[PDB]
């Protein structure tokens, strides 16, 4: 039977983890008033850093592996980001004071992908030694662009009931920045040999980054925390349950294709948590211009501040502990 | 020595090339945009020969984004001295 | 259009997080900062509703910090087109 | 408080040390230059007491970088509030 | 007989290199119309980043190597610059509907050095286990100088008839950015010691931070391109065959420091690059500043456009495939 | 009889090491007249990525050392922090023509820490393999804060006596940048686990950046230098003389550790030089917020132009060298 007793020193593992320090430690700094800013031209060429290493290392993997062994991975991708946004039409669209446009906006980024939280689980699925398929990192766009476009054609239709076209919408949420960086280091690592480039300038330094923008993050949530608190009370109960839910259904549509293929039950481990993860960073520029109607603090502020320290936190260590004592690890 | 009006749109990032679009299609000889902060966002200066083509490109952005983003228009009364692209080939 | 007075405080750059509690505390309903070179600097840009208003930033800004710090303050007279939180509740 | 003329020149990045030079010899009391985006412009903006020393500044930049470079300059009337190197020790 | 079979796999090698595959993917992602944009201040820190290895490594290696035998092949460069400047002078200052002014300023970029293509040659050199002279590097300077130098006199002087300082027109050239950085890195590599922030900081994402610049270079690319349309016709055969020509004479000459001293056969090859190569980075600026009635549209759009792909595409596979059919290789 | 031979082969080490060289090309380059700026954007991440560092190296070695052999040298780094900016209060604030504002802010940044000479203490002590104790990087916080504060308390309360609140002066100079960024990375390091973040990110490129920033300040240096002369003739005197008083205070202080406890003879090198460096990162801002009255260039110009050269290239070479002939070696 599943234990606890080292599920609480892998939540602490993860609680000191680069990753997730700094975006706390971002919050203390913050909340202690402090006035160091980091300009927004590095916030900018961080953005795209990060996502170009992940499209890159998404690119070198799926021309490396065979793609009918990847197929129903990415097949389950694509049907879970669709299917959380709409989790959240019919569960957070429903309860007394909760808009119906913000709760498809926040339903899009939960049903999005975290490029933080899938970088800390395969940094702890191999510091825990359990092996997973090198492509898992090539899911990132299966599950981020469904999940975003789903968001957008869904609260567009209901605008219009309200008083249609998808190729449109697609194009402009897809052509925006933080997207068409990753589709460029796809791209790239399709056709092209970026290996030179990526090994020495992309990879070494990715989650060097990522421990500045968690930051910058963890220093602006803050102030989301707080001003969440003047849209409603059930953003804060989805937020902490969202991603618990989210992680329990792709586990166990990963194990169906841990059965039907030879899909590794350490790589069930990412399908899980990059479902349970609350995308921060390509997610709400690309909601903010496919729904301005939605308010801009009810899902980047349950996003961000509540969405990605859960599934961060609370899910990586669930979901590598339940994976341990099911098999491999 | 032409009079001019100046249009500052201060508007969201976002809008930055959506704004854009609406002043090119207005006929305007030229923006000047730049970066601005505020408690991130964006600042157009549009000079319009006219006020009744400065309140064209203000009513065309307010009614179609404003509703949803935050932002403030203003006009304010400048003569240009010299330009080639505003005071036509041989003015001002 | 809704008649407006535009402050322009030009400071130093170490002094964003003090001028910036002067105008809010000031009830000015929104500022405009931005980056500056010059000879670094920043550029404050408040819309006022009346002179006297204006004014009073003007001074409490001054007298706090010019006699030690170096800065530039001006009033130029501009008309709001379009502004939720400038225009009240309707407006303009 | 003090009449001033707000001479604006915005032109290309390449000018920014050149067109300085203009603005220094001709006896003006600081400027203010910024960064302009678009796809690389700067901004300037210089206070003057008078529109013919404003103009002066105009006239000896337009005839000596306009016919090759690209830009636009424009007068806008502001009033001085508070300025030691603008008002003289003790002024405005 | 000799074969073109291996240039053609050489000519792919060079398309799918990070320094011509990120040019190549920033054409098309800005054709396909992206909204990302590297900052400015970005941009600036990598112009010079990029330089200041070019200069330090011309640098360490100017002192550490004996100078009597690269006094000629750096003889020749300086002269390979004031040649190649003339010849647009005398060749394309000719066409029906060509400003000289314009010809000039595209002759002194396409004859000054390019360190995107530059650096590909050592890299494709390496890589096919071609020896190079290790101060092949320090060229860099030595010829790029003249020929910025040139193209600004040359106009200028041609100017002046329809209505002639030199020192003058070098100082403030000289003191540019994009150019006192490489000077501030070749003052440092010969009298200092900087290895330990040259291989640690410059040298190991040089090549990372190229890629970016290449990315700016190739967006950019694309507005260039059309531009370039409206200008002449003769742009674009100049800049197609220029590359190939100014490489030719390039070659000869580098053979005859082949046989007249110790050069070695894949020393001709950074010789025969770096000519064919036309100025990007440290070129247009310095041109903007020499001559500002030229047209800022024929000199930049010829050279970053079609100056730059050709001569890392088409001249590096032709000039090595010449070498290995020559010699050693 | 101890020779000063070896000395002049150390200074001219000194001259020729990346640190210093930087900072003397910058006023080269500065002088010379370029236009290279570095964008401030670049500045202002480089500042908070070397003191992060320093903060980061600074918590890994607290709670891996054992705190009762460090308690001493951290005490004496307090004290002298203090005694520091008493000692320009009773010797510079009292030349015939000195504003005692301005001396109270100089003795400020005189009895702070530089990052820039502290980062050449530890590299040049390796380079003559001297063990020095592994915590030394933790001392910075424990004399900088303290020199900082007691020159805008000591400042403040002559200003009132001159014609009031203890505790906003600390929070307020402690919480700016450049010192809240150093706390950040210390809590990180003493509670968290950095070590796969800062090992990958911030150690590696910590003294690429320094060379950069170095530039920075001595591009800028050109500036302050000449017009440090318009505001009075002892500014120069003391910012010659100080780091040398103050470095041989600190040798005598630390001596005492090296009998009392364990401190390495190569550890009192680290104590001598981090007390005779002028800080001029993190401390020109915190005083221009604390001491508004002082003029920003009297004790800027004359601890980033004259403090930081002589603090790091005639004293290291005279404190390692003394150490050498004491003792370890």
Known sequence: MDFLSNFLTDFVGQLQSPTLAFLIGG??????????????????????????????????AIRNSNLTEMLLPVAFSV??????????????????????????????????????????????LEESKISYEAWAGALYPFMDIPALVTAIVVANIYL???????????????????????????????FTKPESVYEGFYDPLFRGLLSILMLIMGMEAWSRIGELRKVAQWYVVYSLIAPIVHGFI????GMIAHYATGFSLGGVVVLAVIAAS?????????????????????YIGS??????????????????????????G | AKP????????????????????????????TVMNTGGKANIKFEILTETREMAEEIADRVAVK??????????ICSAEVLYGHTFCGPEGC
């Open chain 2, 65 to 74: 984004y404003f509703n949803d983003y935050a932002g403030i228009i203003y």
């Open chain 2, 4 to 31: 001019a009006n100046k249009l500052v749109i201060v508007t969201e990032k976002i809008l930055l090339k959506k704004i854009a679009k609406i002043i090119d299609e207005s006929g305007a000889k030229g923006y």
């Open chain 1, 160 to 190: 219009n009931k309200r008083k249609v076209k998808i190729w449109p919408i697609i194009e402009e949420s897809l052509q925006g920045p933080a997207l068409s960086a990753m589709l460029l280091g796809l791209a790239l690592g399709i």
């Open chain 1, 303 to 328: 996003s961000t501040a509540i969405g990605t320290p859960i599934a961060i936190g609370v899910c990586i260590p669930l979901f590598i502990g339940l994976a341990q004592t099911l098999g491999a």
């Open chain 1, 27 to 60: 919050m203390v700094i913050a909340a202690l008033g402090t006035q160091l800013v980091i300009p927004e031209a590095i916030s900018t060429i961080i953005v795209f850093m990060l996502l170009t290493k992940i499209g890159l290392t998404g690119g070198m």
């Open chain 1, 250 to 253: 792709a586990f166990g549509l």
């Open chain 1, 79 to 124: 049907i879970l980001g669709i299917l959380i946004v709409f989790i959240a039409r019919f569960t957070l669209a429903k309860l007394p004071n909760v808009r119906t446009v913000d709760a498809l906006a926040t339903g899009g980024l939960f049903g999005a992908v975290s490029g933080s939280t899938m970088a800390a689980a395969l940094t702890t």
């Open chain 1, 278 to 298: 609350s995308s921060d960073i390509s997610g709400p520029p690309t909601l903010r211009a496919g729904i301005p109607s939605a308010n801009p603090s009810a």
